[PDB]
Design an enzyme around this catalytic site. Structure first.
Site, PDB file in Angstrom:
ATOM      1  N   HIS A  20       8.779 -11.464   0.205  1.00 41.97           N
ATOM      2  CA  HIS A  20       7.485 -11.053   0.769  1.00 41.97           C
ATOM      3  C   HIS A  20       6.467 -12.198   0.842  1.00 41.97           C
ATOM      4  CE1 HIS A  20       4.716  -7.703   1.816  1.00 41.97           C
ATOM      5  NE2 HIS A  20       3.799  -8.500   1.298  1.00 41.97           N
ATOM      6  N   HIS A 200       4.900  -1.289  -4.537  1.00 41.15           N
ATOM      7  CA  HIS A 200       3.665  -0.513  -4.293  1.00 41.15           C
ATOM      8  C   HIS A 200       3.770   1.016  -4.474  1.00 41.15           C
ATOM      9  CE1 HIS A 200       0.862  -3.726  -3.000  1.00 41.15           C
ATOM     10  NE2 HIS A 200       1.955  -4.320  -2.550  1.00 41.15           N
ATOM     11  N   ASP A 291       5.185 -12.929  -2.961  1.00 42.10           N
ATOM     12  CA  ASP A 291       3.907 -12.361  -2.504  1.00 42.10           C
ATOM     13  C   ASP A 291       2.864 -13.468  -2.241  1.00 42.10           C
ATOM     14  OD1 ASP A 291       2.179 -10.260  -1.679  1.00 42.10           O
ATOM     15  OD2 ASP A 291       1.457  -9.904  -3.708  1.00 42.10           O
TER      16      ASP A 291
END
Ligand SMILES: [Cl-]
Ligand SMILES: [Cl-]
Ligand SMILES: [Zn+2]
Ligand SMILES: [Zn+2]
Ligand SMILES: [Zn+2]
Ligand SMILES: [Zn+2]
Lengths: 381, 381
Positions: A20, A200, A291
């Site tokens: 990600h 998430h 991330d």
């Protein structure tokens, strides 16, 4: 150092595939998706943790570029939901234009074979994922078109509850895990060959998805709960169900998810999290999910996308075997995408029915009677 | 008859490619895009002018399947515009699912080469177009993603004015042809390799588009004005500018566009319209644009998709040469799609800038200062 040369050799042998990166949203923030005559800036960015020079420097083999758009904030719920769908297509558009304008660095990939062929040519295998179901606007038809546009994973939520599942960071709970719609969507995601992403999502939503899914899933950017208690991290319960599912937990560089105090977080903490999961559920179910560009600042030693050789060297220094480091780098996420596509081919080959949207009746009984009368007239000719 | 055998031989030698069919919207009307276990009905439909048995019977070589959704009727203009975008993806989805579930009959095509390879295998070359700019929701990014999903022409309007151009059947005029946005979109459509379709647009909008476009355009379903005066038909002025543009007028079977009284319209009228255009601007700029399933009833002798051999035989009976009939059948529309792709490749190869959307600022000056300060901190490491 013999350890640095070893890390460089591994990065050339197999692709390090990051789970990600939110560099497409930084382009929306900074350039507003207008990259015409901005190569100087795209190679050397004035903001963020990702640019095309630093991307080369870190020897990254592949990347799932995130196509995230925020959760809808509008009082008109219909407008906000539909606005997220339009913004999704804008972010998919700029990702495709970023890849197409820089073909020497980036190359589009949507499979295990396309990742390898990209890596053989010396490109960063550029895959796409969306960070939340709110992005489809309750349209399973739209979701299949997102798959056709190159999206290969879907995070079930971002930081908001939707019709399908609960987010981790929002209370109170709405569905208590997955909704009935969510449960039915898991079958459709497995059928189409869309990789499920459980980052998430709430702990209960993870548990239910891991039991239900017929294909292996991922956590595109989540860390370990036992080392650091947070709603976004994965519990020992869900780590065991991930093992049964045959999925991969791609470890996050978010400082809040690695230490109680954010300024204390480091490269060593990321390695602790990888080794914890690798020790308990095996190194074939662990990955790297930075991330990058979903945070202002990173850990000490993992400041930006040029720092991946330090992570590979750090794992080898701790006594993780070459074969296990190669697995954590990218072989594991390649396997999951390969197994997701194989499951989809089995289900599509068997002729399983696809999930259709609930549509309004466009014609009344008067129009339908005219159409049937008209058809019968043609039959008598 | 030697004329019937001649027509059958031509239909086997070259593909008859129809410019416009609204069978996907009939599936939305009748089935609501749920075709699971509906093969019996899809092969033998209880309504409409198109099904998979009759499609085979007429020996049709290719088809541009329309992905039309109605003009937005909602009082909330934002909701209606965004709703059209979601419905567009639903119609593109059911078109793709229709092709995929029936691979022996239908095969997807998005180029001249893909049309031929489909025709060699014995499939109907299934292309896609959208009937109006209202379908993109003012998003040029969305339009590029529609091209990626397989859309190869865009009708500039349907029966409503939009931000880009004026429709034919609406008064008063809004832009008086194309808007400034419309003029700029013509460049973008030429650059991406999207075929411009001038059906449903006003006479003034046609004139301006034909002068501006660097690639050849089409009328996917329009007839001749001199033979029948109607807002939807093409004037002698625009027919001459179509010749200079190198485009094709694909003649419509709509009864309102062929005769003053609709019940008087026939196959002979369609042939009169083809011969008129073929005589005046040459047979290399004329096509067939049925508009089947965009009407309740068709002309006498052109009732449904099984009637194409009667049209080919009728043209040969009137003294149109085999070579000119082959052109009208499909060679002309193949050339335009081929030239549209060649122009796009020239412009993309030259590095022309793409049209970007007007986006809102997501970050304020406080956030941008933090990001620049953060970048400088990383530079000093
Ligand atoms: Cl609807
Ligand atoms: Cl916007
Ligand atoms: Zn993100
Ligand atoms: Zn995230
Ligand atoms: Zn139509
Ligand atoms: Zn029409």
């Amino acid at each position: 150092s013999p350890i640095e040369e070893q890390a460089t050799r591994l990065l050339k042998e197999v692709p390090l595939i990051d789970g990600h990166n939110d560099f497409p949203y930084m382009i929306r923030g900074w350039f507003r998706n207008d990259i015409n005559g901005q190569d100087a800036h795209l190679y050397d960015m004035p903001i963020g943790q990702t640019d095309l020079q630093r991307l080369q420097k870190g020897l990254l083999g592949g990347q799932f570029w995130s196509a995230f758009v925020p959760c809808p904030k509008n009082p008109d719920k219909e407008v906000g939901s539909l606005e997220a769908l339009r913004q999704t297509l804008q972010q998919l558009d700029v990702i495709h234009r970023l890849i197409e304008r820089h073909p020497t660095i980036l190359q589009f990939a949507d499979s295990a074979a396309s990742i390898w062929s990209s890596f053989r040519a010396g490109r960063v295998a550029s895959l796409i994922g969306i960070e939340g179901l709110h992005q489809i606007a309750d349209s399973v038809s739209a979701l299949r078109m997102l798959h056709r546009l190159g999206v290969r994973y879907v995070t079930l939520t971002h930081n908001c509850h939707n019709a399908f599942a609960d987010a981790a960071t929002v209370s109170p709970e709405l569905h208590g895990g997955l909704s009935r719609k969510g449960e039915r969507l898991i079958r459709e995601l497995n059928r189409m060959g869309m990789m499920i992403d459980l980052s998430h999502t709430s702990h209960e939503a993870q548990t239910q998805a891991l039991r239900l899914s017929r294909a292996p899933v991922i956590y595109s950017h989540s860390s370990i709960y036992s080392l650091r208690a947070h709603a976004r991290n994965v519990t020992d319960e869900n780590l065991h169900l991930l093992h049964r599912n045959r999925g991969v937990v791609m470890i996050c560089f978010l400082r809040e998810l690695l230490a109680s105090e954010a300024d204390q977080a480091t490269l060593a903490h990321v390695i602790d999290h990888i080794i914890y999961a690798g020790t308990r559920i095996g190194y074939e179910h662990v990955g790297i999910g930075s991330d990058f560009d979903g945070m202002l600042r990173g850990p000490d030693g993992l400041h930006d996308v040029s720092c991946y050789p330090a992570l590979v060297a750090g794992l080898l220094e701790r006594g993780v075997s070459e074969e296990d480091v190669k697995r954590v780098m990218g072989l594991n996420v390649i396997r999951v995408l390969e197994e997701v596509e194989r499951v989809a081919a089995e289900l599509q080959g068997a002729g399983e029915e696809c999930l259709c949207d609930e549509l309004d009746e466009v014609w009344n009984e008067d129009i339908k009677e005219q159409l049937t009368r008209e058809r019968e007239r043609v039959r008598k000719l």
